[PDB]
């Protein structure tokens, strides 16, 4: 009867009929061109005077290893 319980049952019902977006989901997929849906991005800042300011600690940093060249493990193991 609670609000969260109804939403959880809706999501469990939507767990079935999932995968590559068949049926009604083909039309419902076009809601992203109709109501400005925000995608799964991480926000890097905030507007103060309408000019966006990217906070430098929220800029993306990738900890790549020192050398991936002549490293002795490949993505494939011999049979």
């Amino acid at each position: 009867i609670g609000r969260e319980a109804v939403v959880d049952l809706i999501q469990q019902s939507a767990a079935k009929q999932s995968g590559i977006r068949k049926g009604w989901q083909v039309k419902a997929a076009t809601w992203v061109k109709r109501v400005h849906v925000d995608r799964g991005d991480v926000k890097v800042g905030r507007l103060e005077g309408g000019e966006f300011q990217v906070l430098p600690h929220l800029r993306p940093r990738y900890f790549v290893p020192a050398d991936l060249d002549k490293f002795q493990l490949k993505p494939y193991v011999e049979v």
Binding site: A29, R39, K43, Y62
Partner: protein, 158 residues
């Protein structure tokens, strides 16, 4: 298996404005996917030697950022990225008619297309590699040119 949840337009309207995180960690084990599209064969020969192009277009997932694509290319592939331009695309609709005629309709997963403009690596900048004619003569020739024909119809024979 846990997968993509349904979202609701009223829910994103009500619980709106995602906030920036308080801390950002350097990303060990990143989950980010890029792929090129088709290149012209002369561009493919341009990549085969010296490994460079001024403009390369990529397919990504729509949860990425221009900063993330620029940082990933600079960090992993050693490139110099000047600017990124991102386009959000819908999936293609697919039709796969069944044993009884049903018109089974699919939709590909939504993708983001990035246009990445590159920069010459170090000292190699000569490979930008490009008489006159008056623009008054250009416009006057393009005004006396024959018009484009109207588009034929798919049943029409010409």
């Amino acid at each position: 298996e846990q997968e993509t949840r349904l979202r609701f337009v009223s829910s994103e309207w009500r619980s709106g404005r995602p906030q920036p995180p308080e801390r950002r960690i350097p990303i060990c084990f990143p989950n980010i996917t890029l792929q090129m599209m088709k290149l012209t064969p002369e561009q493919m020969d341009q990549v085969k030697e010296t490994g460079w192009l001024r403009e390369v277009a990529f397919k990504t997932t729509p949860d990425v950022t221009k900063l993330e694509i620029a940082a990933f290319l600079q960090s992993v592939y050693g490139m110099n990225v000047e600017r990124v331009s991102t386009i959000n695309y819908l999936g293609r609709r697919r039709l796969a008619i069944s044993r009884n005629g049903k018109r089974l309709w699919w939709r590909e997963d939504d993708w983001k297309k990035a246009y990445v403009i590159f920069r010459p690596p170090a000292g190699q900048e000569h490979l930008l590699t490009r008489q006159q004619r008056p623009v008054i003569e250009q416009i006057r020739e393009a005004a006396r040119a024959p018009r484009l024909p109207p588009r034929p119809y798919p049943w029409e024979r010409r």
